[PDB]
Amino acid sequence: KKRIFIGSSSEQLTILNEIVDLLGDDVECIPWTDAFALNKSGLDSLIKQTRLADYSILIATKDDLTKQSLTKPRDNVVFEFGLFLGAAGPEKCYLIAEEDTDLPTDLDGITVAKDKIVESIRTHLVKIAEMSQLGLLPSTALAIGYYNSFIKRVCEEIHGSECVELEGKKIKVKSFRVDVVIPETLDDNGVGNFTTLYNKRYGLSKATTCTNPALLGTRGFPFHFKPVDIHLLDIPSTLSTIVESLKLYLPSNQVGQDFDMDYLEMRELENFAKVLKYLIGRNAATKGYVNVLTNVK
Template sequence: MKKLFIGSSSEAKKYAEEAKSILKDHFDVTIWYENALGSSVFNLNQNFLTDLLKASLEFDFGILIGTKDDKVKCRRTRKLQPRDNVIFELGLFTGRLGISKCAFVVEEDVKLPSDINGITLAIFDKHKKDSFKSEIEKVSGHFLRSSDEEINFFPSVTLASVYYENFLLPTCKYLIENKGLDYLDKHYDNCKVNVIIPENIQDDVNLQFQRLKHRFTTKDTEIQCAGRPRKITIEAEVRDEALMIIDFPTIISGINYAIKNLFPDDFNTTSQKYLSILGRELGRFISTLHKLLSRNEFGDLVVIRKESDL
């Protein structure tokens, strides 16, 4: 079940609780003051921004509820706007998750930032029965229809894009342009690129992949791709008259570095929170590769396999 975060001001907790009661059948919902993965989303004596960054990595969707909490003077006119921290959280979650995975549910006539365009906006009238419920149900349907493969700005997505551009794209182009690959004095027109993804990321990823490599009998060969200053080294083996290119994307070590740099004080590779974030990031790495391969119709050339499937 997808994980959903609800943020609101303290004054709007009743709306957050009502939203959770509506959404709980379709999502694993956590309100900002509740526990998530065994600990509170916002911890005492912790850096508020650090807690928010963690939350933005732990959840698949975010709903921020904006109510008339603060009086502000705007161009000589007094208006009511949501609490500043709610607007800040909306920006953070939108940047992390993408605009299709976040929604701003706001009270009618509340003052909104001028650059709110593009964000899913649901407006309710607190004086009308079921108005809030109706808007939350609309947001729920929007989230349920959203794609799991949307490319956003998570570290895993960036790393997958770099891996695709620097290895998968030129390799697939080479195989198509040369109608296969010469390997050990023989030309193979039936070629597949196998990308092996581990179940977890160890401190020494190169050593980790060396151990995985022992399961194969690959030999190195080089290909010169057009427009590239140097050759690409690949590892391959022959199986049933087909050439299998085997690659281990060591670039995923960047996921560990990103998590560690975000949460230096409580980075623990055995904790439930870390394992949850890591599993989510590896899943995004894989889904991003699938989307990029599909865009260029390379899906038939590349197989992405988890270590457990070997």
């Protein structure tokens, strides 16, 4: 599944397909050959895959004998590696290099990959599939904010003050459990419509966190929920921002079901849920009391 952009020179077209075989299955190894859309600039398509491919396995070999004789890698490949590295990062972009390909002088002292090599590469790939860092699409950062502004805040407040405020009347929280519902698919308009739908299907009564006059400048946290056991349910409104940034991430001329963006937004919901699950295992005020529901409806 995970989309991997394999960039290599036109003459390195048999190593490419060997590397495709070497990590065949559970990964959508896409080469640079089918990564170029018709009637599009090569740089545009390269940037665009950079915005789609999860990782990159660029292959640098003995070509373009250069001058400063020294068999360097390929200016196309070096450009591509720079681009993918700047967009994705060393964690996510990798440079297979054969025995002596004379890496750039910027790429010196940096251990690049040199068949078992692909094996270790794939293990590292899986290692980084459990890790969520910042990206142009702010799923990681949006999850961090959602958790350090609402989930952690609400969890701490309910743990602290034994009550939630429905309608100004206060009800008492004896058992506390909240479910973060990640919609299976984001609407163009955001999540507000799905949120209203979902809330209305269930009883999900609207109550807010109880404040005290001890802290004057403290904000309340309205939410929906079901000596009461409370099944709090929240659909992160921040996900709307995602469907906004996607419009900036991949500006699209046409209106229609785009697989590229369907995958991109599903991946970003994946990352949002992953980050939330991590950050729930983190704090004891949320450990075991916040559950995450992924791929809903």
